[PDB]
């Protein structure tokens, strides 16, 4: 149940802070993407919650834990991180996501390219402390906060997944609670207690008629129902996998920030520039489930939902090659000049080369004559706090706050559902227009119920299968995902010549090292993957293995490569998990076989 | 006489030290950063070679006990024959010569053992190649194929990702990414789940606190009371410098030894890298002097986190980074003029006595994750060094740079981006304009006067910077500061706009409030704008960002 | 000083599993499937009482599974249909019907410890020989441990990671990591 | 849970202007704080300061029992105040606007004008109205005498806000103060409190 909203309208002037200044500013209001003040969803979780733990004390008659504390972690999930000792139950997520509350669309369209209506929005408060003892002004406490005019009205998109056994009186109970906290809200944001951020929260399609069912009710209400997850259900009746694959390009368009967990490390949580296929796969579940067993195809195979990586020259960005390197004073993708390719061309004489690592290329060809486009996903720092709710405050610095790196919205990324015709004949005999479901807005990854997440889905025209040279002279292999493999003790590994064995296998040949001096062979890195597994309920095998970008070329010292048995690999990846994108192989690449050294990159309402 | 050279480096040293943003583990991880390529090699070397290295440096804690080499065998004597011989220790790095194969195998084995069992998750390698001591510079040829074959190693070599591994039933380290295997505590004193290396550098912090004794007893001395103290602080700084003209000189150093002789450059080398040490712990103990003396607190809020040769890596309060950054450069170009193991090599090089450095300024809230705040001044640090390519030794061929010390630094404001080029991108409001004037020359304009791109310098010299922060620090008769900050956030909302709107606001306040005449850069004195390879770019914008963090304590 | 590996291709869970019942005795079994992520322990014998219902594959079943015991480990991980690859990792040379011996010096071992999740629960499960540990951040976990969990107990997975040279240059690492026992500390 | 309250108190009442008033906001004296309407307002921090600043000195600098009303940033056991003070728009009377007050100081050899030494100051004028923007949250069943005795010294006239409070300024006094009561520790209170706006004090009482 999307579709709900909350509306704050801000009778004061108002603060969401940033928990700092800057410069001549002593403390500054968090602004959106488009530079405006709102109000994030997570402050406005914070908030709500707290007023219906205000409500559900009063119905508890003070009662710390209890019946209707517990309304408030079936309704907002509990609070494991507070909770210690041997708590046996699982923790219960929200039902309501809400969102970042935003100004009006057509407010923020009127905005675009008035800088500086866009800072007028705000103004300086000046605040000083007086001593108690002279009277006067004391310097140094001198301050100027920035705060936001009082009349804005924010809206923010809630979303309540209620569970769908949930009884029609526990509908009313959930419908009054959130009706009642949002009622007896009355303050957001800095400086709550000294005037700022007075506000009315209300939802739409909930009044006083929710409210009062309450007071009318409460008295019978019970325990809410116990939380369970949604279980995957499996027929195993798919059909076995046939040739040709299908190739269903997916466009995903972040529309808010996006955290992708990179790595948690106490308070911070480091965020991915690419989507992993992972997160798709929900997506792929409550789309697609109804036409073909997605958990029997995951299971053989017959599923490769890749990463979504930026968008370059229309296409999906692949992973810089580490085989790049740029003169270290003047060069580099960066400055789009003295990138060399290692594998082709010597150290020039005199001059350092560093490593190319991150960012993602676009399309290249053997004679292009520029270098290839370039990409970069825009990320930022998110900052949020626990409050303790005894003292109304952060407990400390170091355990009171927290921060997401997330991707932030407006970007578009390219991911690839390949599919094998088995199935599409039979998705295709189900439904005629399936590729049209494949258009959706779905939150993924951390903190997905909040200000995070929200992203859009849209499906393109089946894209043209990987065609690649077959070369018998040399095999170069680009990376353009994380590759798994498991080394001969089923541990995971960082031996490349596991890789080499695997690749000669795979492709039923003999591989050598390239033996000059004056060029590189290979050029990998280890990459350490410490996701989640959330149907575990516990944490996934860590996966060790090469990162993206990742290069290595050989000579073929015996055998044909089979150009349809190359492509087949650049369809279905190598090594272990390729169903969520790991094992993205590049054949032949000519960005590889190039040399580089000479060429530079192309130039409101 | 032949032998083999063995050169044995950690790296990594970002994933090591900063993969937690503990103050403890940082510290504990710089402990054990040392120790692997000083102490575990020493008895890594007595243990392979019979010797008591180890015993002589514990007894100096000190590596000049290598200099004389009565002491540290000249193997290339056969009548003072042994098997060893140590080129350089050093933070992350160190040489040795040996006489045979299987002992340079051997301690490699040895040294790399000993980091897995005592400094877990340390990427710690090594490698050795051929010697031929009958050629002249052959060790100079030995030292650049250990250090380019090393490179290619490492595009291969199994990463210490792969040990410590989650099991789904394993739970967290309370500070890392790891899975957790024992306990600690919080500074609050809560007992937590910790990590194998994150339990190991905790131990080893308690190690740091010697080995910084020496330098300045006022350093560490309460890990306790230091760590509460950083992150009750409102900013952090992770400074990072390195040595400009240490890798030209290195990259060549055969062509300044003077006499050929592999005895020549392996002593002329050794001196070099010892007095750069000593170069940086003076220079060190001189800069903290920035830094004020509380009472209260026992300790400096600094944290020396490594500390020798081209690499200094020091966490510190943040609003005294700037000056104590300044002050270290300063203080470590003096350093390298009085050195003679320094004057005559940078004089060869050069053409001066002196060496430089640039150095990366992060500064950072506490709960800033400091991975990423390191990743910046690596970036920083690439910035200042763009006074190699436009600060340069007249008539020198190949262009060679001449010693000019730079800073580049950010601070992280909340929406400022928090990688380098988004952090930068933010800033260039038009592609004709760039809000920022980096890096910031240190290096005295008198020292620089005979280089080419004088002119160049003086247009980027941090004093610029400096008074242009004294101007908004400053104070009117009424003992109001003589820029408002209502009209400093005008200005920054002008700096914004396109140049004519910019400079159009510019002339309206600077009628009003005359001193911002001195913030002009045209020279025309109508805009806060110059001209700068066809890019408007304006000191003013660092000047504001930059206001609170010149705070020094000095005077 | 090695370490021997014994390596199967194309063989179901159940029957490796099977094939390696005398050394996997009382072992306890780590089980990844897309829903459950479950320990369970062989009998003293080295059986599983649902055996083939509990290691089938073909309905959201078991992918990938690890035995380990003092003196060895089962490794097994699907590559087609629920076939696959079962490596046992043992520090004692032992014979096994259709398994590949093969071996690896390593020039010490050391231990290491993994912390599991939880606090002993307020009463453990009613299956002997097991306990349950909980968290609020997951929850209950049954572990297979037939100590009587005393509060403030904590339970250790205990692993041992062998230490070999990966390098002619003799630069060292750590090559494998064998899980022994759940031990309480 | 959220902080626990006994009793929330809503207290309310209209804020006199017994002298003009100047409060100032960053943009000689001539700045007066206003809101984002651009509206003439009393700030909350500049009241509550006014009214903690009055409890200060009644409590001779009892830090303790002024912590306990107005919250501390620092002690372990506190954080956030129980009192909360609202912004309050200025209601200056119909016909009025903002005055200058335009003065000099006078040079104590010569008894004329002092070179250098004159000033300007806008001032809210006298009678304009502001509302009393008070809320409460008791953690115990009652109300607190030191906050009594700030409503009394409220209405007594005794508590001096902004500016050039010695020479000439901020005489403030309180009428028609009025407290509702919420009882938050219970279903009839809560509900109360989003319904049927509380449970009427008698002041006089």
């Known amino acids: 149940m999307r579709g709900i909203e909350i509306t704050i309208t801000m009778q004061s002037d108002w603060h969401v802070g940033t928990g700092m200044g800057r410069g001549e500013l002593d403390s500054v209001v968090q602004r959106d993407g488009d530079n405006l003040p709102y109000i994030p969803g997570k402050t406005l979780t914070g908030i709500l919650r707290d007023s219906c733990e205000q409500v559900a004390l009063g119905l508890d008659n003070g009662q710390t834990r209890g019946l209707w504390h517990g309304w408030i972690n079936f309704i907002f999930g509990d609070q494991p991180a507070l909770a210690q000792g041997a708590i046996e139950p699982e923790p219960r997520p929200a039902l309501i996501a809400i969102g970042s509350a935003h100004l009006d669309p057509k407010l923020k369209a009127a905005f675009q390219g008035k800088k500086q209506l866009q800072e007028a929005i705000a103004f300086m408060k000046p605040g000083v402390a007086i001593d108690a003892i002279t009277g006067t002004a004391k310097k140094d406490f001198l301050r100027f906060e920035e705060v936001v005019r009082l009349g804005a009205k924010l809206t923010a998109e809630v979303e309540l997944n209620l569970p769908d056994n949930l009884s029609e009186t526990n509908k009313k109970v959930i419908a009054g609670i959130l009706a009642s906290g949002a009622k007896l809200t009355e303050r957001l944001g800095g400086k709550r207690r000294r005037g700022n951020g007075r506000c009315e929260l209300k939802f739409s399609g909930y009044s006083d008629q929710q409210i009062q069912w309450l007071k009318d009710n409460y008295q019978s209400v019970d325990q809410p129902p116990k939380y369970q997850q949604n279980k995957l259900q499996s027929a195993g009746d798919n059909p076995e996998q046939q040739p040709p694959w299908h190739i269903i390009p997916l466009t995903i368009k972040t529309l808010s920030p996006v955290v992708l967990p990179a790595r948690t490390v106490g308070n911070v949580v480091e965020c991915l520039d690419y989507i992993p296929g992972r997160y798709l796969l929900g997506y792929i579940h409550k789309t697609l489930g109804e036409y073909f067993d997605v958990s029997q195809a995951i299971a053989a195979g017959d599923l490769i939902i890749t990463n979504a990586t930026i968008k370059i020259d229309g296409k999906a960005g692949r992973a810089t090659p580490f085989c790049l390197f740029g003169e270290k004073l003047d060069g580099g993708l960066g400055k789009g000049k003295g990138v060399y390719n290692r594998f082709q061309e010597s150290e020039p004489d005199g001059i350092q080369l560093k490593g190319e690592r991150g960012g993602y290329v676009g399309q290249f060809e053997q004679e292009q004559r520029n270098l290839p486009n370039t990409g970069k996903i825009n990320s930022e720092l998110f900052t949020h706090n626990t409050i303790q709710d005894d003292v109304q405050r952060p407990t400390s610095d170091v355990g009171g706050v927290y921060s997401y790196e997330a991707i932030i919205a407006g970007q578009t990324f390219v991911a690839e559902l390949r599919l094998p015709d088995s199935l599409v004949k039979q998705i295709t005999s189900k439904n005629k227009n399936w590729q049209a479901q494949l258009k959706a807005t779905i939150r993924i990854g951390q903190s997905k119920k909040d200000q995070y997440g929200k992203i859009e889905v849209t499906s393109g025209n089946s894209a043209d299968l990987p065609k690649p040279t077959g070369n018998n002279k040399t095999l170069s292999i680009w990376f353009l995902s994380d590759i798994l493999l498991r080394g001969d003790r089923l541990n995971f590994n960082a031996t490349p010549d596991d890789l080499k064995k695997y690749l000669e296998n795979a492709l039923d040949i003999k591989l050598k090292e390239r033996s000059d001096n004056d060029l590189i062979c290979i050029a990998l890195r280890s990459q350490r993957t410490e996701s989640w597994q959330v149907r575990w309920g516990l944490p996934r095998p860590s996966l060790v293995g090469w990162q993206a970008g990742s290069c290595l070329i050989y000579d073929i010292e015996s055998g044909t490569v089979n150009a349809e048995k190359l492509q087949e690999l650049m369809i279905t990846g190598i090594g272990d998990r390729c169903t969520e994108g790991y094992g993205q192989i590049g054949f032949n690449d000519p960005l590889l076989s190039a040399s580089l050294g000479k060429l530079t990159a192309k130039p409101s309402n | 006489f032949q032998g083999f050279l063995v050169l044995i480096e950690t790296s990594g040293n970002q994933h090591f030290i900063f993969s937690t943003n503990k103050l403890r583990e940082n510290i504990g991880a710089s402990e054990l950063t040392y120790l692997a390529t000083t102490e575990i090699l020493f008895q890594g070397v007595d243990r392979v070679f019979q010797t008591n290295y180890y015993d002589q440096w514990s007894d100096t804690n000190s590596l000049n006990f290598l200099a004389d080499s009565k002491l540290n065998p000249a193997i290339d004597d056969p009548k003072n024959n042994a098997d060893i011989e140590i080129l350089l220790a050093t933070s992350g790095k160190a040489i040795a010569l040996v006489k045979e194969e299987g002992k340079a195998k051997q301690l490699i084995k040895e040294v790399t053992k000993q980091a897995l069992i005592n400094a877990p998750g340390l990427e710690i390698g090594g490698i050795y190649v051929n010697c031929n001591w009958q050629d002249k510079l052959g060790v100079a040829k030995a030292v650049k194929e250990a250090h380019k074959q090393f490179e290619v190693n490492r595009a291969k070599r199994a990463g210490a990702n792969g040990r410590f591994l989650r099991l789904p039933i394993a739970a967290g380290c309370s500070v890392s990414e790891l899975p957790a295997s024992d306990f600690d505590y919080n500074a609050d004193g809560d007992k937590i789940p910790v990590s194998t290396v994150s339990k190991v550098k905790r131990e080893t912090a308690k190690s740091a606190k010697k080995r910084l004794r020496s330098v300045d007893g006022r350093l560490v001395n309460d890990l306790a009371q230091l760590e509460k103290s950083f992150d009750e602080l409102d900013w952090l700084a992770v400074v990072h410098a390195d040595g400009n003209g240490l890798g030209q000189i290195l990259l060549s150093l055969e062509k300044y030894i003077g006499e050929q002789t592999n005895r020549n450059y392996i002593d002329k080398y050794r001196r070099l890298s010892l007095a750069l040490d000593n170069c940086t712990i003076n220079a060190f103990k001189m800069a903290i002097a920035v830094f004020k003396e509380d009472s209260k607190k026992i300790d400096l809020p600094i944290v020396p986190l490594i500390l020798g040769g081209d690499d200094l890596t020091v966490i510190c309060r943040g609003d005294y980074a700037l000056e104590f950054t300044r002050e270290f450069l300063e203080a470590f170009e003096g350093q390298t003029e009085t050195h003679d193991d320094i004057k005559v090599i940078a004089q060869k090089a050069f053409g001066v006595d002196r060496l430089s450095a640039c150095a990366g300024i992060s500064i950072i809230k506490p709960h800033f994750p400091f991975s990423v705040a390191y990743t910046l001044a690596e970036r920083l640090i690439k910035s200042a060094k763009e006074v190699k390519q436009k600060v340069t030794v007249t008539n020198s061929s190949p262009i060679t740079p001449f010693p000019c010390s730079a800073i580049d630094f950010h601070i992280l404001y909340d929406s400022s981006g928090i990688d380098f080029d988004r952090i930068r991108e933010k800033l260039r409001p038009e592609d004709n304009t760039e809000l920022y004037n980096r890096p910031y020359v240190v290096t005295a304009a008198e020292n620089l006067s005979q280089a080419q791109g004088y002119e160049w310098s003086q247009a980027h010299s941090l004093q610029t910077l400096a008074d242009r922060v004294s101007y908004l620090r400053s104070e009117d008769g009424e003992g109001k500061s003589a820029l408002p900050s209502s009209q400093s956030h005008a200005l920054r909302t002008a700096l914004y706009l396109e140049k004519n709107e910019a400079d159009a606001q510019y002339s309206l306040i600077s009628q009003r409030y005359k001193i911002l005449k001195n913030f002009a850069e045209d020279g025309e004195n109508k805009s806060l704008f110059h001209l700068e390879n066809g890019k408007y770019v304006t000191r003013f914008l660092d000047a504001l960002d930059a206001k609170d963090f010149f705070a020094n304590a000095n005077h | ?185 | 849970m959220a902080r626990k309250v006994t009793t929330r108190w809503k207290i309310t009442g209209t804020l006199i202007a017994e002298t003009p008033l100047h409060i100032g906001g960053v943009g000689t004296d001539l700045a007066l704080a206003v809101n984002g309407a651009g509206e003439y307002y009393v700030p909350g921090t500049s009241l509550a300061g006014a009214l903690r600043g009055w409890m200060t000195q009644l409590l001779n600098n009892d830090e303790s029992q002024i912590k306990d009303l107005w919250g501390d940033h620092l002690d372990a056991k506190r954080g956030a105040s129980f009192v909360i003070v609202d912004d309050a728009v200025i209601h200056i009377p119909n016909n009025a606007d903002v005055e200058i007050r335009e003065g000099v100081g006078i040079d104590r050899h010569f008894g004329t004008a002092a070179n250098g030494f004159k000033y300007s100051r806008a001032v809210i004028p006298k009678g304009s109205k502001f509302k009393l923007p008070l809320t409460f949250d008791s953690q115990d069943d009652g109300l607190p005498n030191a906050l009594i005795q700030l409503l009394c010294a409220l209405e007594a006239g005794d508590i001096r806000l902004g500016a050039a409070k010695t020479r000439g300024l901020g005489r403030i006094k309180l009428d028609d103060l009025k407290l509702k009561s919420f009882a938050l520790d219970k279903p009839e209170g809560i509900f109360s409190a989003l319904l049927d706006q509380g449970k009427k004090l008698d002041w006089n009482q």
Not at chain 3, 25 to 46: F, M, R, T
Not at chain 3, 49 to 56: A, G, M
Not at chain 3, 170 to 179: K, P, Q, S, T, Y
Request: aromatic letters at 10%; a negative charge.
């Open chain 3, 1 to 185: 000083k090695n370490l021997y590996h014994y390596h199967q291709y194309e063989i179901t869970l159940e029957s490796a599993v099977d094939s390696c019942k005398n050394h996997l005795q009382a072992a306890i079994g780590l089980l990844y499937s897309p829903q459950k992520c479950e320990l369970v322990k062989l009998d003293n014998s080295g059986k599983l009482v649902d055996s083939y219902n509990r290691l089938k594959f073909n309905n959201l079943g078991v992918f990938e599974a690890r035995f380990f015991n003092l003196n060895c480990e089962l490794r097994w991980v699907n590559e087609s249909n629920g076939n696959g690859t079962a490596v046992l990792l043992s520090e004692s040379d032992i014979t096994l019907t259709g398994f590949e011996k093969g071996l690896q010096e390593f020039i010490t071992a050391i231990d290491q410890q993994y912390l599991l999740w939880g606090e002993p629960a307020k009463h453990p499960p009613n299956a002997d020989g097991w306990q349950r540990l909980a968290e609020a951040r997951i929850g209950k976990l049954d572990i297979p441990l037939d100590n009587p969990l005393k509060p403030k107990d904590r339970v250790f997975l205990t692993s041992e990671e062998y230490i070999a040279e990966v390098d002619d240059f003799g630069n060292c690492a750590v090559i494998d990591e064998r899980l022994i026992k759940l031990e309480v500390k």
